[PDB]
Design a protein around this ligand. Structure first.
Ligand code: C5P
Ligand code: C5P
Ligand code: MG
Ligand code: MG
Ligand code: MG
Ligand code: MG
Ligand code: MG
Ligand code: MG
Lengths: 218, 220
RNA sequence: AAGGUCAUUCGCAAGAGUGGCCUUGCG
RNA sequence: AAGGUCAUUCGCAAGAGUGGCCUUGCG
């Protein structure tokens, strides 16, 4: 089964016990699972992104690069790099069916496995990772698709003008449990907006977006 | 320059000295060439070095165990400790302001990105050189339990296990100039209450929480 | 990391550094 | 990442994962 992934990955695993381990959720096999490779994989991949970022950025200033890094190492962006490999079909998982958290953890653990299996060659694993995603990463930046952080953008403009911060207050929580939706107000001076999501923090994000809209004509 | 010293201490000689100079230079000294960029890459690079060492050598590879260790090992305090070996502060070029733990912590992670770039971006060699100096020294600190304790975190899990409550920190005073201050903070759980001091709220809270921890486990 | 803020150094402003404070996001 | 808690899943417990909330630490 792994052979199809190894074609996409373009790498033949010498020890297949690792590749299986990184693909296995603890609900499948308790004693063998991706947990420890996800820990190694993060620091490994987060290093790749930053290393790539410092090389190809016209502006190398830390203030410019760090928020750009914040999105590229995010779990959501890892889910997009996973779509290229179609990871959701390769995972061994039983209960707690696949979601963006599980995928991002496998993707992190996946590269740690390659690092280990190659005999801890960081230089090669880097270029193998680059081979796949280098253009894809440079794509999003050059073509300007980067998840915009609205709660941050908002409060920076409000403090720019009135030297104050927007206030996010809850309205209601609606749904049975995990289907529950949050409704949150966002207020700056005389302006109020709304937003919603599966969490408070998410509901505060959409409300923050609608609020930047609300000051245009202002 | 005088860079011959640090190179021998580092067991590595730079092909580009301008790159080595840039790692030791604060923005104040040179508004043109300084360490800001290498600090960025250096964090991600050196953070990876530590994490790879933990997963490898320690018998307990369980994540919940390893992550707290990482927190101390990648910290600013621990980088200042590792930097004392290299005697970095005497090589640091700075215009205005004292050289503090922040600057040294910045220079340290930045200094390693310099070695990284100068090696032709060889991670295997650089990681080896990092272990060359610090591997046993780091591993000995864990073995001997020289890891710094987190008192705000320990205390909270202590109370939530017993009283199902959280400690509450109150600020009882402030004294001194605005740039150099003094913080006295009280920590409270049930009727048990202690004080603590620090140059920041959190630093004083860690001291207050520590006293509470000692007071508690005694009484409990 | 980023923004506002007080203090301070750059003779003041501009901006920048460092320490304190509040807040936001990423891992 | 860690702890408490609500829900949910492995027939309960134990232990663990997932979604929610409060909190704490590190980069
Ligand atoms: N609160 C923080 C602390 C660090 N960071 C990230 O970690 C990097 C390294 O920060 P340090 O200067 O603390 O080592 C930053 O450049 C930034 O990308 C962050 O994004 N948010
Ligand atoms: N709040 C957080 C989140 C993540 N982390 C670090 O990031 C690692 C991976 O976390 P993720 O699951 O978010 O990718 C953790 O094992 C821990 O070392 C942290 O130290 N503090
Ligand atoms: Mg995890
Ligand atoms: Mg991660
Ligand atoms: Mg900085
Ligand atoms: Mg750092
Ligand atoms: Mg900053
Ligand atoms: Mg966790």
């Amino acid at each position: 089964m792994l052979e199809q992934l190894e074609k996409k990955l373009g790498y033949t695993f010498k020890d297949k016990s690792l590749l299986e381990k990184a693909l296995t959720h603890v609900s499948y096999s308790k004693k063998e699972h991706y947990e420890t490779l996800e820990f190694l994989g993060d620091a490994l991949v987060n290093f790749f992104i930053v290393d790539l970022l410092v090389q190809y950025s016209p502006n190398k200033r830390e203030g410019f690069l760090s928020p750009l890094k914040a999105y590229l190492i995010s779990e959501e962006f890892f889910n997009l790099l996973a779509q290229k490999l179609e990871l959701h079909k390769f995972i061994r998982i039983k209960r707690g069916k696949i979601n963006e958290t599980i995928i991002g953890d496998v993707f992190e653990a996946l590269w740690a496995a390659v690092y280990i299996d190659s005999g801890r060659d960081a230089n090669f694993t880097r270029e193998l990772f680059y081979k796949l995603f280098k253009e894809d990463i440079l794509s999003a930046i050059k073509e300007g698709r980067v998840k915009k952080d609205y709660k941050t953008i908002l409060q920076e403009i409000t403090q720019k003008r009135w030297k104050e911060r927007p206030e996010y207050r809850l309205i209601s929580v609606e749904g049975p449990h995990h289907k529950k939706k949050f409704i949150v107000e966002a207020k700056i001076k005389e302006y109020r907006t709304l937003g919603e999501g599966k969490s408070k923090k998410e509901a505060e994000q959409r409300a923050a977006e609608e609020l930047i809209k609300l000051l245009e004509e202002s």
